[PDB]
């Protein structure tokens, strides 16, 4: 559908921001686990990958339709801890706040696009 193509980029950006938000909050929650590595995703590359499949064929009514079913990069440690935990509070707190801001911005842009498509139709 052409409607999907217009809203594909913002929807994928919003979903990627939510996933990275979950990853950052997991990093915050597991700050005290000894031996836990701080993981993160490269937002731009994954957004390229998602923006850039074959539903199995259903011959009749009984035939069952096809059933549907990101890469994590390690953060470079800054300070060496003794328990092997590489999670840094300041870095991930700033990243968490930034991701929240960008999620809000994506919501704003997507809502503006939908509202414009709506006022085009209203009459």
């Amino acid at each position: 559908d052409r409607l999907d193509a217009a809203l594909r980029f913002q929807q994928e950006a919003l979903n990627l921001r939510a996933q990275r938000q979950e990853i950052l909050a997991a990093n915050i929650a597991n700050a005290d686990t000894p031996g836990y590595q701080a993981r993160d995703i490269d937002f731009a590359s994954e957004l390229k990958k998602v923006m850039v499949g074959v539903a199995l064929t259903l011959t009749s009514s009984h035939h069952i339709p096809a059933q549907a079913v990101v890469d994590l990069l390690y953060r470079v440690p800054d300070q060496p801890s003794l328990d092997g935990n590489t999670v840094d509070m300041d870095r991930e707190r700033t990243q968490f706040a930034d991701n929240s801001l960008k999620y809000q911005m994506g919501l704003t842009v997507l809502g503006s696009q939908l509202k414009g498509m709506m006022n085009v139709l209203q009459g």
Binding site: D32, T33, Y36, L72, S100, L107, G111
Partner: protein, 131 residues
């Protein structure tokens, strides 16, 4: 929505660690338990809780273990609890370590609280989308 589970698990784990630290502080000078054995200091074990296969997730307290650190020996031969040499086993609680654990658990608790507040606000605002 998984972030609520992650942060709630983090809050529960930090509460458990704080309770263990409080128990260690309370019985630093304790002599005996309900039986004749001394008070072995407690420590929680943190693990990464990922029920699905995506590597990471929240923190979970797998177990509460008694530190294998050696038991302090005090010379008290008149105590019925003393062994053949007249020594009594007193706990090996690290006072400074437990106070630092209390404060660090409190700070991590607040950080998770702030995360929950922020994401709750974002999830409330996403329902407004285009309306």
């Amino acid at each position: 929505l998984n972030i609520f589970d992650i942060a709630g698990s983090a809050l529960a784990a930090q509460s458990k660690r704080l309770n263990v630290a409080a128990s260690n502080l309370a019985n630093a000078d304790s002599v005996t338990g309900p039986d004749g054995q001394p008070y072995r200091a407690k420590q929680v074990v943190f693990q990464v809780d990922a029920a699905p296969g995506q590597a990471t997730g929240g923190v979970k307290v797998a177990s509460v273990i008694e530190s294998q650190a050696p038991e302090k020996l005090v010379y008290e031969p008149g105590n019925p609890l003393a062994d053949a040499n007249g020594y009594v086993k007193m706990p090996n609680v690290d006072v400074v370590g437990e106070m630092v654990n209390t404060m660090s658990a409190s700070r991590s608790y607040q950080a998770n609280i702030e995360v929950l507040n922020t994401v709750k606000s974002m999830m409330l605002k996403t329902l407004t989308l285009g309306q």
